[PDB]
Design a binder for these strands. Structure first.
Ligand SMILES: [Mg+2]
Ligand SMILES: [Zn+2]
Lengths: 147, 94, 170, 1112, 110, 56, 221, 14, 55
DNA sequence: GCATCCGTGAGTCGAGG
DNA sequence: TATAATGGGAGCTGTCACGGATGC
RNA sequence: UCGA
């Protein structure tokens, strides 16, 4: 980018690469149900490991896994996003066998269903906000006060 | 740009919350025939017709202009929804 | 594919303010048509909705009052302009439409860089946000004058270029 | 006006007939003017010779064929939407081998489309053009193995679908392998099958060290040709029983059979030249005296071993070299499809010979023409290389006819097309134009034939050269292939010549494409002209040498897009090709012989020749072309005018006095104006509209059908339910709009009524019916109206009825009506303009005359172009054009400046001085001195170093004029433009892309069947597609509600869209959206895949999105 | 019949079926028209007494969907068929007067 | 003198200090006067404007 | 005051190369093989090319065009991949509270491997501007507090301190180190670069990151 | 691979 | 209720039969004259539904 | 462990027919 | 409702990177 | 096939 004269902030590339490092491979199950060589999210294995550590069990031995954007995209938890990306047959078959549940965490799933995306004005942070004028606010406050 | 947009962004912790507040308020004004406005008759947004100045039909314009006056309260869980609805239907019949 | 949309050939907008675009009358009429029917009923131009629509159906049955009615309709509202390919979010921007005679969409010079639009015959699509919510979104967030700087480099996207620079430097 | 012409180069030969690549090909393929006995083995005659005789009556043989006359002329075919074609009869004879009985008959095979005089076709009323196709010439090639350096691959390639490619490669284990239909097998086996003995292979191939030892296998020589043959048949055909006759049949069909395997005549020649041998037939081998006989394989293997060893005289092959790439013209493609259809008919013939009575059979009973007809009709209708003709202007048709495509049937697939095929090969010189080619994904695949280029009988492109002997340049012209051209040193056409002798001791020449400086003693050949390096379109660009190749490409392309103008005029500056183009395009009417013109009329020109015979030439008037541009001829002569042979009679469309006129000559100033010319936008004077410059006629065709239905017949009638006289005013008695009426959007072109569908009136309908006391009519209004943003004056009405003479429609159709609506288009904001140099832009502003920058004498300019457009585009040709056009504006003359032999700078300077004398001296005679503003500008220019200080005002003004710059006054102020501005005459065309055609908008409209989403397209009154990327845009903006609005209310949510519309017309805010229909479609389509898709709540309990409609 | 998947311009771009409008499902304009029609019909039937309005609604079948005879409406309200046919007549005629005066229902007649 | 970079920096600094509304007004101003002056300035392109230096 | 010179200098139009082609020599050209012709075009467009020269040019022109044509598809595909991998990432909260961070180097090893040298200003800016400090930084008598969003002036200051040898690297909150699930926090992301202020929670930065990377893609040569 | 060939084989068995 | 999740799994033949409103017996679409759905065909109204609203 | 075949992908809108 | 008839026939293939199964 |  610098070579071609394009000014671009590192943070974006960092976002992508962050999605590339999302996965890990098990080097030993310990006390878990996981299998040696099994691949899963770093998050879920950290959760499983803190749950096993809090339980006094042996944590899972894992190794960092670096994958490219295509594989990382196809490897996500949401089957709607994956199936809509590409290799639809594979994604669909594997997901259907596993009886997978898409939790609609991302944008693409909600876009498929035509729901309100969990971003911007649809973010659960800002979407429940209310607006009331002082006249109405006091009119309700009096009803609250009389009871 | 929208007049006083910097101040509006200044009011909120997330720009999207500003958008939500403005839209909801505009819906309130639309539903109630503007009867609930916090704007004095001089502060009323005006459209220029062939005849002359009339009330600005745009509820969003009204919403932002109201919001600028600080006469509105925004936030999360200020009141049960149905309560707000019915109290506003009482005060301002539509 | 969506409703309340249209497209046409773009043309330079030099008179337009940063927040504005020239929108042809015919396009505007068709796009806003239900609002125009309602407004036509509010005023004395038609007894009801259906008579109004039947009135608009033929071109020679269109009279002058309907245009002022249309002008009353669009007031304060914005439309979305989009040029393909849309590479980043600035390939879509919001503008207050200003009705113009002629069939071409007028586009502000300063947003030409973000759209990567020039005058060699590029075309743009128009979309109409309906709900108060959609319009509030487009007006606060998506307004051309509300995004000055690149989401990518943080540097100004809308800046003087071509003749502007030429004149100022001169 | 007088036409001055420049340049020192005298063209020896003229440009060959420009459409000949089509005409001569198709003629050669037909031979309808040739008596059947004198016809050659090329063409459909060849196909007949290949297909017949048909055996196993028993024998059905071919004698001859003939083509009758077309049942309809061309104009009538265009009228009735028929195909212009001639009936094909074939004389055949059935022969019983035993009986000896011979039954001969002439059978009708259906119709073959006939190419018109101009080189195009008419298919179903539509003019079409069959584009030539470039491909790899058949032959034997040798290319380096990418994986194994030092090792090479042999490839034997026949004509497309003439049988398999074959690969000879030397394996890592040393054995020599052959690949056929993706099967690797040792070549030694097949060699044995050919009857080769270890002795012969040892003596022939032994010379090369250790290579022949990889060819040595004892187990192969241990079996006779039969055993080896059956072995090979077992190798290439797993599971199929290895019968002797079946093996012989398969191998024969694969290798020796001419009816299956055919190298080109070209392929044969190339094989002979490369391998240094001679081929009896066109196959790889033969069947002679019961055994197979080698032709190709052994010399090929020899060459492969020689190349691999490093034996000198054996080189690889460049497959992009124009000697190895040939051209399949219309004749060859049509011939191929003819061969296919014929073979189908042959299969049908044997199938017919098996069945039926063996005694009584006639050629009529055996032959079913249907498959052949199907093949031909399919080729002319649905083929890739059969394209809707571009008629926009004559140059469009001409160029379209000269196109070369690397795609199509038998051609490359886009995925297989890399840089190589798209590149400009060194051998393209004089053959394929380096400039003209599409921008975008099609680049390099579609090309144009060079101006002087010729395609020989083999299919290779040849370019003319001049023989040079002992430093003397002859008038002898030699057309060479690329392979031939590579043999000589060839000097450039601009090489200085005194008389016929080369005048310089250092000349610029080419050896195998490489530029080299040589002596006149070393010059074998010399270019005919620079014109031969470029296409026709590229050769229409003056000062091409001053333009960068990309913008040159753009202008070259944009010339075909020029819309014919009513006032259209030839360029002030031409290349001198503007005449030949109009002539070869058959756009303009010409005089056949010498004589006197008897009659001149708008519709007609009658000429008496020297023979005394009266010839009446009709004139095409206001005919609608494919793209809808008006095509009409106007008479250029007058009563009693004496005319010679080849003299102009009528000017075709886009023509002025026999010269090609693609646009207007306008007076331009180059300078920014108030941001209105910003980024390629253009500013025009209203004076252009006033005098009707850039105005064009456009005809649009509307059609309708009244047909028989099961609810009762539709009918065209003036009786339309619920319509006043206001609506029916311009309709005639029969319900068809009158000729000459003015139609606007919503108006009725053709009245039509159709019986309503079976209708259960909803209670509202019944109650309203009763209220207004009116019976609901049987029919309803289907009438064809004017589409939004269309209309004009009706110039024609055609009506065809069932049961009327000469009229038979498709089954069920009662009547067909066509309304033709003309419209006259003035230039307007949003319309596209361009010059020949690649400068293009849409008009953004039209200023009233008083606002235009003007000359001191008060003359306002026409167009204002932004100078910022020049420097990065690097096309300077438009500047020189403009200057010389200023000169031509004042002297009142036009010029001819050929590309690479163009009007140089000093000459333009001279003409500019001569112009200045007129532009100024006139003023000084009128009794006017220099203006104050002129003085200010002159001070500004003195500071600019533009003029020499100390000179008089007039001297400096002239100094500016010689630089092509003048003083300009702002129309709004009266104050001068601070600097001198470049002003002159430029040739600008109005292109076909016009905002009137391109503007569209929709509120709501028709929807797709399955998805319930808006239809696409302007013609369908459909919505704009909001794609994945626009969804990304909205997401990135974080506007959730606008996006959700797009995904539901605006497209596929039926409940949501209905509710939304009702809410808006009622004046209420739009309702919360529901589940979009296409998601339900997704769910169902997944259920059809036996996959259970359940939408669940947070409690994991199913939620019905079908609302119980889908649950029992 | 012909395949909806038939290509028109070559292959990938579009299908023959992509140009075919759906004539079954009512356009939003149509549904809105029926909505305004039902609403305006109720607006016209509110200017009549509830009995004659109900008689008209039964006779035209705006209630249960089907149109009753004179004997069934006569047995529903408890009068003679002549009486109910005449109530239907006076209701229809009062609707004629209301319509001629206001001119609200004319447009829907197409 | 004011060229692309300095104008861009002006726009950025104006954004930071005075906010986007005022920045929009500034941009429109610059557009106006820029076009205005570029029109009357006398900028053009002649063939002699491309100068072959002797040193060549 | 020459038009070409002015247009080039101001940045209105043109670069030295195109100007050279108009005035000085057109220059060397490529053979189709990528190999360069030993004989350059000595002509400008002002003078005009010989037909042979023009022909030599068309190789390069065509190669360029075909190359761009083939490139835009790859750019598009890349962009789509990026969008699909980044789409679920939105700013979900104010702080994930992670104590982790990344250290942006202000210095890079020289190619001679002789010493370390200061990075180019553009690059430092590209890794610094609009980012929250994960630790206290005291340089040039100025305190930059933990949690501070670095403005452009902050970055220029840090560069100045780097030149004076006070700081060789800057600790910074980054999306790499953010512990927010299904997204990033506000502090790790820093500025919303369009508004030059801290990013508003709920902004979907995944699509912005992908679009930001994708758009220039056809410009890369 | 090819059902026709396979069936012709299975037919050639009897 | 609101849809918070989408599950995909295999359909047992019993489930497939539970979905069905009937078995299509004949490979027939519509009648060559009446142009109406054939009985026990792919378009049969007896299975998939009425062609006209409430009829 | 390392050649090889198989399946999978390969830019967006818009126009014409 | 009856001579006897018994294994098909198309078929040009100028791209590339990858992942996963397979073959020595 | 064409336009960006
Ligand atoms: Mg463009
Ligand atoms: Zn964080």
């Amino acid at each position: 980018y610098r070579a071609q004269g394009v000014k671009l902030h590192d943070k974006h590339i960092e976002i992508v690469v962050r999605q590339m490092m999302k996965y890990v491979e098990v080097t030993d199950p310990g006390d878990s149900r996981l299998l040696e060589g099994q691949v899963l999210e770093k998050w879920d294995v950290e959760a499983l490991n803190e749950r096993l550590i809090a339980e006094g069990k042996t944590p899972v031995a894992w190794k960092p896994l670096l994958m490219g954007v295509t594989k990382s995209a196809l490897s996500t938890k949401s089957w709607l996003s994956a199936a809509s990306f590409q290799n639809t047959t594979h994604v669909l078959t594997e997901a259907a066998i596993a009886g997978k549940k898409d939790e609609l965490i991302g944008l693409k799933e909600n876009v498929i269903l035509g729901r309100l995306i969990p971003a911007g004005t649809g973010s659960d942070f800002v979407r429940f906000t209310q607006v009331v004028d002082q006249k109405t606010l006091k009119a309700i406050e009096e009803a609250r006060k009389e009871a | 740009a929208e007049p006083g947009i910097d101040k509006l962004f200044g009011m909120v912790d997330s720009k999207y919350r500003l958008t939500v507040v403005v839209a909801k308020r505009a819906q309130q004004l639309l539903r109630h025939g503007f009867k609930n406005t916090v704007l004095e008759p001089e502060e009323r947004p005006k459209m220029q017709t062939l005849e002359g100045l009339f009330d600005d039909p745009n509820a969003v314009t009204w919403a932002m202009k109201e919001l600028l006056t600080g006469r509105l309260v925004f936030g999360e869980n200020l009141v049960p929804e149905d309560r707000l609805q019915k109290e506003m239907e009482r005060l301002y019949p539509v | 594919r969506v409703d309340y949309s249209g497209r046409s050939v773009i043309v330079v907008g030099p008179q337009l303010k940063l927040h504005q675009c020239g929108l042809p009358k015919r396009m505007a009429l068709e796009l806003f048509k239900p609002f125009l029917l309602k407004k036509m009923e509010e005023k004395g131009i038609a007894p009801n909705v259906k008579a109004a629509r039947r009135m608009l159906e033929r071109q020679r049955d269109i009279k002058d009052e309907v245009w002022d009615a249309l002008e009353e309709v669009i007031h304060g509202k914005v439309v979305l302009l989009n040029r393909a390919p849309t590479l980043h979010r600035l390939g879509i921007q919001a503008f207050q439409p200003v009705l113009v005679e002629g069939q071409s969409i007028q586009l502000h010079p300063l947003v030409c860089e973000a759209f990567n639009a020039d005058f060699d015959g590029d075309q743009m699509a128009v979309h109409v946000p309906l709900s108060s919510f959609a319009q509030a979104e487009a007006r606060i967030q998506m307004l051309s004058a509300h995004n000055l700087l690149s989401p990518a480099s943080g540097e100004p996207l809308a800046k003087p270029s071509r003749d502007i620079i030429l004149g100022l430097y001169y | 006006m007088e036409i001055k012409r420049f340049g020192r180069i005298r063209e020896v030969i003229p440009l060959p007939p420009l459409t000949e690549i089509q005409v001569e090909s198709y003629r050669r393929a037909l031979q309808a003017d040739v008596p059947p006995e004198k016809r050659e083995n090329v063409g459909i005659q060849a196909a007949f010779r290949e297909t017949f005789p048909i055996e196993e009556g028993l024998v059905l043989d071919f004698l001859e064929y003939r083509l009758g006359e077309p049942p309809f002329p061309q104009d009538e075919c265009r009228e009735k939407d028929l195909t212009y074609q001639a009936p094909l009869y074939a004389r055949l004879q059935l022969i019983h081998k035993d009986t000896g009985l011979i039954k001969e008959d002439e059978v009708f095979l259906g119709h073959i489309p006939l190419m018109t005089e101009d080189g195009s076709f008419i298919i179903n009323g539509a003019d079409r053009v069959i584009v030539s196709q470039i491909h790899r010439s058949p032959g034997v090639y040798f290319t380096p193995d990418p994986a194994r350096p030092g090792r090479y691959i042999a490839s034997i390639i026949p004509l497309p679908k003439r049988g398999p490619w074959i690969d000879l490669e030397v394996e890592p284990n040393g054995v020599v392998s052959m690949k056929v239909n993706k099967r690797k097998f040792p070549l030694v086996l097949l060699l044995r099958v050919l009857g080769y003995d270890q002795e012969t292979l040892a003596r022939e191939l032994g010379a090369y060290g250790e290579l022949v030892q990889g060819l040595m296998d004892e187990s192969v020589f241990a079996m006779r040709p039969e055993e080896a043959l059956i072995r090979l048949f077992t190798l290439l055909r797993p599971g199929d029983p290895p019968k002797r006759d079946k093996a012989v049949a398969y191998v024969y069909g694969l290798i020796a059979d001419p009816r299956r395997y055919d190298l080109g005549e070209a392929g044969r020649y190339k094989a002979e030249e490369k391998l240094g041998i001679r081929l009896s037939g066109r196959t790889l081998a033969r069947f002679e005296d019961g055994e197979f006989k080698d032709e190709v394989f052994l010399p090929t293997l020899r060459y492969l071993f020689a190349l691999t060893a490093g034996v000198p005289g054996h080189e690889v092959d460049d497959i992009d070299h124009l000697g190895n790439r040939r051209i399949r013209t219309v004749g060859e493609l049509m011939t191929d499809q003819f061969r296919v259809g014929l073979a189908r008919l042959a299969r049908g013939v044997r199938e017919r010979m098996l069945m039926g009575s063996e005694d009584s059979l006639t050629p009529a009973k055996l032959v079913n023409s249907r498959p052949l007809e199907a093949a031909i009709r399919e080729f002319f209708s649905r083929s890739q290389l059969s394209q809707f003709k571009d008629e926009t202007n004559p140059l469009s048709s001409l160029r379209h006819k000269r196109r070369i495509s690397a795609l199509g049937p038998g051609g490359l697939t886009r995925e297989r097309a890399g840089f190589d095929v798209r590149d400009v090969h060194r051998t393209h010189y004089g053959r394929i134009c380096p400039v003209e080619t599409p921008e975008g994904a099609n680049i390099g695949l579609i090309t144009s034939l060079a101006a002087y280029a010729r395609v020989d009988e083999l299919g290779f492109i040849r370019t003319p050269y001049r023989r040079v002997v002992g430093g003397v340049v002859t008038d002898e012209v030699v057309y060479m292939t690329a392979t031939e051209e590579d043999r000589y040193t060839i000097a450039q056409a601009n090489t200085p010549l005194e008389g016929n002798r080369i005048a310089a001791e250092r000349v610029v020449a080419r050896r195998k494409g490489e530029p080299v400086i040589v002596s006149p003693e070393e010059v074998e050949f010399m270019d005919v002209s620079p014109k031969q390096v470029f296409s026709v379109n590229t050769n229409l660009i003056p000062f091409l040498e001053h333009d960068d190749a990309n913008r040159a490409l753009m202008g070259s392309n944009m010339q075909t897009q020029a819309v014919p103008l009513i006032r259209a005029q030839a360029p002030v500056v031409m290349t001198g090709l503007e005449e030949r183009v109009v002539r070869d395009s058959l756009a303009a009417l010409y005089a056949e012989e010498d004589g006197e013109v008897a009659k001149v009329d708008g519709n007609r020109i009658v000429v008496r020749y020297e023979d005394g015979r009266l010839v009446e030439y009709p004139l095409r008037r206001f005919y609608r072309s494919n793209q809808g541009t008006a095509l009409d001829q106007r008479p250029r002569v007058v009563v009693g005018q004496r005319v010679r042979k080849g003299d102009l009679l009528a000017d075709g469309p886009a023509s002025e006095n026999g010269f090609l006129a693609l646009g207007q000559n306008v007076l331009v100033a180059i300078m920014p104006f108030d941001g209105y010319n910003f980024e390629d936008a253009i500013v025009i004077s209203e004076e252009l509209l006033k005098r009707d410059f850039y105005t064009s006629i456009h005809i649009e065709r509307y059609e309708i059908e009244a047909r028989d239905t099961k609810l009762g017949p539709e009918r065209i009638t003036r009786d339309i339910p619920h319509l006043s006289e206001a609506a029916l005013r311009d309709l005639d008695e029969e319900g068809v709009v009158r000729i000459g009426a003015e139609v606007k959007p919503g108006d009725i072109l053709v009245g039509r009524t159709s019986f309503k569908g079976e209708s259960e009136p909803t209670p509202e309908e019944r109650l309203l019916r009763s209220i207004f006391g009116e019976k609901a009519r049987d029919v309803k209004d289907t009438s064809l109206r004017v589409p939004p943003g269309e209309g004009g004056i009706v110039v024609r009405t055609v009506r065809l009825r069932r049961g009327d003479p000469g009229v038979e429609l498709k089954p069920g159709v009662r009547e067909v009506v066509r309304v033709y609506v003309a419209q006259k288009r003035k230039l307007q904001v949003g319309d596209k303009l361009a010059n020949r140099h690649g400068n293009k832009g849409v008009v953004a502003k039209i200023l009233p005359v008083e606002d235009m920058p003007h000359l001191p004498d008060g003359t306002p300019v026409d167009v204002i172009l932004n100078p910022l457009g020049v420097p990065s585009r690097m096309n300077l040709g438009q500047i020189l054009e403009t200057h010389l056009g200023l000169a031509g504006y004042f002297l009142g003359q036009r010029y001819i400046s050929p590309i690479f032999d163009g009007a140089k700078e000093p000459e333009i300077k001279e003409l500019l001085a001569q112009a200045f004398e007129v532009y100024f001296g006139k003023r000084k005679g009128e009794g006017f001195g220099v203006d104050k503003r002129e003085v200010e500008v002159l001070r500004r220019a003195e500071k600019l170093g533009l003029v020499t200080p100390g000179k008089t005002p007039e001297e400096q003004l002239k100094e500016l004029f010689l630089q092509g710059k003048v003083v300009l006054y702002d129309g709004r102020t009266g104050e001068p433009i601070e600097g001198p501005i470049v002003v002159g005459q430029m040739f600008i065309m109005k292109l076909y892309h016009m905002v009137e055609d391109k503007m569209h908008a929709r509120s709501t409209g028709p929807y797709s069947l399955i998805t319930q989403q808006p239809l696409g397209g302007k013609a369908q009154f459909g919505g704009q597609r909001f794609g994945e990327m626009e969804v990304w845009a909205l997401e990135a903006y974080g506007a959730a509600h606008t996006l959700q609005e797009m995904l539901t209310l605006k497209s596929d949510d039926i409940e949501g869209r209905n509710a939304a519309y009702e809410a808006i017309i009622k004046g209420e805010d739009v309702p919360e959206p529901s589940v979009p229909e296409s998601f339900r479609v997704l769910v169902k389509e997944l259920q059809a895949l036996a996959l259970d898709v359940q939408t669940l709540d947070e409690k994991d309990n199913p939620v019905d999105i079908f609302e119980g409609l889908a649950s029992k | 019949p012909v395949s909806l998947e038939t290509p028109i311009g070559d292959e990938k771009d579009s299908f023959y079926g992509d140009f075919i409008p759906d004539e079954h499902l009512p356009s939003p304009v149509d549904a809105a028209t029926q909505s305004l029609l039902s609403e305006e019909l109720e607006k016209a039937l509110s200017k009549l007494s509830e009995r004659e309005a109900m008689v008209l609604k039964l006779r035209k079948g705006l209630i249960d969907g089907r149109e009753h005879t004179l004997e069934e409406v006569g047995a529903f309200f408890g009068v003679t068929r002549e009486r109910i046919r005449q109530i239907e007549n006076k209701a229809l005629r009062k609707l004629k007067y209301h319509e001629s005066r206001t001119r609200k229902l004319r447009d829907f007649l197409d | 003198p004011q060229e692309k970079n300095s104008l861009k920096d002006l726009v950025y600094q104006a954004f930071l200090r005075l906010g986007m509304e005022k920045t929009a007004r500034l941009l429109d101003a610059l557009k106006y006067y820029g076009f205005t002056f570029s029109t009357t300035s006398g900028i053009t392109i002649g063939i002699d404007d491309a100068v072959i230096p002797e040193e060549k | 005051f020459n038009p070409l010179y002015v247009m080039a200098q101001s940045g209105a139009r043109g670069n030295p190369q195109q100007i050279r082609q108009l005035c000085g020599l057109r220059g060397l050209m490529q053979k189709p093989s990528g190999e360069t012709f030993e004989v350059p075009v000595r002509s400008s467009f002002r003078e005009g090319l010989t037909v042979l020269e023009y022909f030599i040019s068309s190789h390069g022109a065509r190669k360029g065009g075909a190359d761009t044509a083939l490139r835009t598809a790859d750019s598009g595909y890349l962009t789509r991949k990026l969008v699909d991998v980044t789409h679920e990432i939105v700013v979900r909260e104010a702080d994930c509270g992670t104590t982790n961070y990344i250290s942006v180097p202000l210095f890079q090893p020289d190619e001679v491997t002789r010493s370390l040298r200061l990075r180019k200003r553009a690059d430092i800016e590209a890794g610094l501007y609009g980012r929250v400090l994960a630790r206290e930084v005291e340089v040039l008598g100025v305190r930059l507090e933990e949690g501070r969003y670095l403005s452009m002036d902050d970055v220029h200051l840090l560069i100045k301190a780097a030149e004076a040898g006070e700081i060789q690297e800057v600790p910074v909150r980054s999306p790499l180190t953010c512990q927010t699930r299904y997204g990033v926090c506000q502090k790790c992301y820093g500025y919303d670069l369009s508004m030059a202020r801290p990013v508003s929670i709920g902004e979907a930065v995944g699509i912005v990151a992908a679009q930001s990377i994708g758009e220039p893609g056809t410009q890369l040569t | 691979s090819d059902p026709v060939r396979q069936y012709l084989h299975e037919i050639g068995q009897v | 209720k609101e849809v918070r999740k989408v599950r995909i799994a295999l359909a047992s033949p019993e489930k497939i039969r539970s979905w069905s409103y009937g078995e299509v017996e004949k490979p027939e679409t519509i009648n060559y004259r009446t142009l109406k759905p054939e009985r026990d065909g792919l378009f049969d109204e007896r299975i998939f539904g009425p062609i006209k609203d409430y009829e």
